[PDB]
A paper describes a structure:
The third one, PCDH1 EC1-4mc at 3.15 Å, was obtained using protein produced by mammalian cells. Residues N89, N248, and N346 are predicted to be N-linked glycosylation sites and sugars can be observed at N248 in the PCDH1 EC1-4mc structure. C-linked glycosylation has been predicted for W186 but is not observed in our structure, while O-linked glycosylation has not been predicted but it is observed at S430. The observed O-linked glycosylated residue S430 is also near the PCDH1-I2 interface. However, sugars observed at N248 and S430 did not interfere with this interface in the crystal. We could not detect structural differences caused by glycosylation, and thus the role of these glycosylation sites in PCDH1 function remains unclear. An additional calcium ion near the EC2–EC3 linker is unique, it is at a crystal contact, and it might be present due to purification and crystallization conditions with high calcium. The PCDH1 EC1-4mc structure does not have this additional calcium ion.
Protocadherin-1 (PCDH1) is a non-clustered δ1 protocadherin involved in respiratory diseases. PCDH1 may bind bronchial epithelial cells and epithelial cells of the airway mucosa together by mediating homophilic adhesion and helping in forming the epithelial barrier. Here we use bead aggregation assays to show that repeats EC1 to EC4 form the minimal adhesive unit for human (Homo sapiens [hs]) PCDH1, despite its longer extracellular domain with seven EC repeats.
Residue numbers in the entry:
A (entry chain A), B (entry chain A): 3 to 23, 32 to 439
Amino acid sequence: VVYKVPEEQPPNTLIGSLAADLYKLEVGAPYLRVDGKTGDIFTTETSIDREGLRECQNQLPGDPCILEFEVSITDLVQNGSPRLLEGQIEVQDINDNTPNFASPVITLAIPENTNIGSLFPIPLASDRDAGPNGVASYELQAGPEAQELFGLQVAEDQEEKQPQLIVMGNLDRERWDSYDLTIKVQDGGSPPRASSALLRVTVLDTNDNAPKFERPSYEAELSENSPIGHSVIQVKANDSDQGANAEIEYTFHQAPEVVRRLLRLDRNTGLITVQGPVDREDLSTLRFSVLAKDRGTNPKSARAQVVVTVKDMNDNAPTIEIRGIGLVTHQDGMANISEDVAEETAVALVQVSDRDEGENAAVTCVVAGDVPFQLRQASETGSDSKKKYFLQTTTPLDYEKVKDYTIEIVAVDSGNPPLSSTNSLKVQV
Amino acid sequence: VVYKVPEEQPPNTLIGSLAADLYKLEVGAPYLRVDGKTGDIFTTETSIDREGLRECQNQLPGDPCILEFEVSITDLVQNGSPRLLEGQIEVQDINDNTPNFASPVITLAIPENTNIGSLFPIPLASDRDAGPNGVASYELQAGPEAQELFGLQVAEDQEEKQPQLIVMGNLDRERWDSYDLTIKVQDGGSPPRASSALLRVTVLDTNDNAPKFERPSYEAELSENSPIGHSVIQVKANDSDQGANAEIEYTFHQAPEVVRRLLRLDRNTGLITVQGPVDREDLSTLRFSVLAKDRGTNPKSARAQVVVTVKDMNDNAPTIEIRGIGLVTHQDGMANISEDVAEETAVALVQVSDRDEGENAAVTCVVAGDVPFQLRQASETGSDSKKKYFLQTTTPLDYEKVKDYTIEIVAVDSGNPPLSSTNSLKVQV
Ligand SMILES: *[C@@H]1O[C@H](CO)[C@@H](O)[C@H](O)[C@H]1NC(C)=O
Ligand SMILES: *[C@@H]1O[C@H](CO)[C@@H](O)[C@H](O)[C@H]1NC(C)=O
Ligand SMILES: *[C@H]1O[C@H](CO)[C@@H](O)[C@H](O)[C@@H]1O
Ligand SMILES: *[C@H]1O[C@H](CO)[C@@H](O)[C@H](O)[C@@H]1O
Ligand SMILES: [Ca+2]
Ligand SMILES: [Ca+2]
Ligand SMILES: [Ca+2]
Ligand SMILES: [Ca+2]
Ligand SMILES: [Ca+2]
Ligand SMILES: [Ca+2]
Ligand SMILES: [Ca+2]
Ligand SMILES: [Ca+2]
Ligand SMILES: [Ca+2]
Ligand SMILES: [Ca+2]
Ligand SMILES: [Ca+2]
Ligand SMILES: [Ca+2]
Ligand SMILES: [Ca+2]
Ligand SMILES: [Ca+2]
Ligand SMILES: [Ca+2]
Ligand SMILES: [Ca+2]
Ligand SMILES: [Ca+2]
Ligand SMILES: [Ca+2]
């Protein structure tokens, strides 16, 4: 015979009697009591916990929880041998357990710019109770800002409710990177029972941002013949992402070889320095681009024009080019004349040249000996390096005191320290 | 005095004469010739290359390229000393050089799902010529499919044309991962000159795809008490991305500790195996989820329900519970009766139980001795393990041949190999 008893009733609640017919309890011992000569059976000071009983442990949904008990009728006119009877009390569930999350703080990581509608699962609540007394609903309590951004959805697919976050609008990590929601679970008892957990959405970073240089363009003066390791310039860029999506590498972009030889760009600090012989007379400007690149898996990159102006040093000593004109013409640094046609006639054309810049290539230019020849402007302009002078005569002269004219010229630039050159010519006669 | 001469003319082209006034060439030597008594000056079998001349090398845009030359008038009624004159021939540019890319194949990497409008720079073409004879336009020749996807844009920002790819629609790597375009550069000469390069767009992979399991759900039978390392089941998932965006890791998701003890999930292969004592009498089903996760920087993940049915083994030997009923009641495995009231009266209630399943818990149940007691059904149902029998009398008996009743019961299950138990009772008298 069967019986329906609510679980966890108070001691000595009567569960019933003889819809059949001394009575003894043979089995059911801790949880029940019977009375002699009545066969009315009541609960004990050990309450029946539907959730406690080994008898009811792994039972599948809606498989009824039955406690076995046996009682003996051992009187039939004190002649019969006793009659036991199989009993079954079906313990009925009450909402005496609260729905729960495994941890009271729950922590989702959602990437930046997840498309609208994207779903993410929330951990399930559980409830040791059965049927409508177990998990019933989920509710998403949220700050205003956050409410426009996040929704809740529940699936009846898996015959057990999987609650899910819907992303309702765009997330940007850079804008804001941490939200706070509470997820309320509730059961379907009366009264119901509920529980909460803090659901923290963490916005994860994507490499959605490129490097930018402090300045679009870069300029720097650099002194010619500087030593190996002299700081030319530091370029630096900026990335609004996080970690390696924002770590930066610097490398030459549109840089011809010459420059590559002379400069060293350091990838971490972005400090260009000298690594080679720098000569303004070779290359007066250094023009190149520089490439800033993040360490994202798909690297984003920027570039900046750099132009280095090479500053002059007086490292070039002037140059006295002596040469012929018209019919007069030199040979291994000496020429011919005799019984000169006139004074103020020209023996040589003389060009003085300096390869540096401004002052350091401004040339003064002087005839050494005691001879009868001067330099006279031939040019009709004032080009400060490119002097063209005639080497012309001062006094007439005859074949008797001649063939002994070593005219030597000297030149100095207005540099500091100054540099000088000397160059000569013999006139035979 | 000045002069305009086109570069790379044929030998002995006349560049002009005396808009002034023997004539000698003093400077300009390799590239020019003058004629005596005329002062008309013409080109040589060394052509003037505007692009060749050291004199014109690093010249900034539109800085004119001038070749210096000096000539001497050394006749003024054969009385004057000679007059030289500064010359300047301004060499004029002709479109004798073709616009070029550094490499003839160019190779851009664009990420999946780059937003429409996103720009990417193409390497610049160069042109050793000057002014309108240098780079003029860029043109993007393209296959139909590819044309809907990619545009060209040129910037006049940097005073030098930076050509750029515009992305015109969505790229999906999984769909198609390599395009072919040609980029045509052309100059602004007449006729113009042009050049091409193969521009290959490579679509780079983003982790835009989650794992999926072969099957939504997984089932497996597993024999109780199997050995450590026995293959239970292999779960496997699938990711349509590339590299580590598609490499997969398997780990238990909603798995209570018990299960964690008994099973070992291997992260690479996704093969669950035995790692602990499995007892159907402890846990008949193993229910858990499994988590597949890619090795993307922001891992995407799937999960699958797994349910393992534990199959029974005859590892439990039956259980003979002897106990009292009504007034008759046992004590350290023996009880009292004397001058029995009748035969077919019951001394004990006897329950035989096996903890296994089906056959291996089907019990036959037999009284050993030569005694006057049998087992008789007390229950009113056929529960195949839970037998309830009376141990009742066969023959009457008196106090003179008694107090020597060791009734022993034996039980065996229908398992293979079968298991047996024996249990006894003394009746004093
Ligand atoms: C570099 O980046 C910051 C943002 O991190 C920006 O506000 C700043 O103006 C940039 N440059 C300097 C000189 O701080
Ligand atoms: C796993 O992935 C492939 C695509 O790579 C899919 O077409 C296939 O059907 C999946 N499963 C099996 C059993 O091949
Ligand atoms: C070049 O030579 C002159 C002497 O002729 C010096 O004055 C000058 O400093 C340098 O030695
Ligand atoms: C239990 O004991 C019995 C003998 O009483 C055997 O038949 C059985 O196989 C097991 O040993
Ligand atoms: Ca309870
Ligand atoms: Ca309950
Ligand atoms: Ca509940
Ligand atoms: Ca962002
Ligand atoms: Ca970045
Ligand atoms: Ca970011
Ligand atoms: Ca130098
Ligand atoms: Ca210098
Ligand atoms: Ca100098
Ligand atoms: Ca040329
Ligand atoms: Ca040209
Ligand atoms: Ca050209
Ligand atoms: Ca894709
Ligand atoms: Ca993936
Ligand atoms: Ca992909
Ligand atoms: Ca077992
Ligand atoms: Ca078993
Ligand atoms: Ca058994």
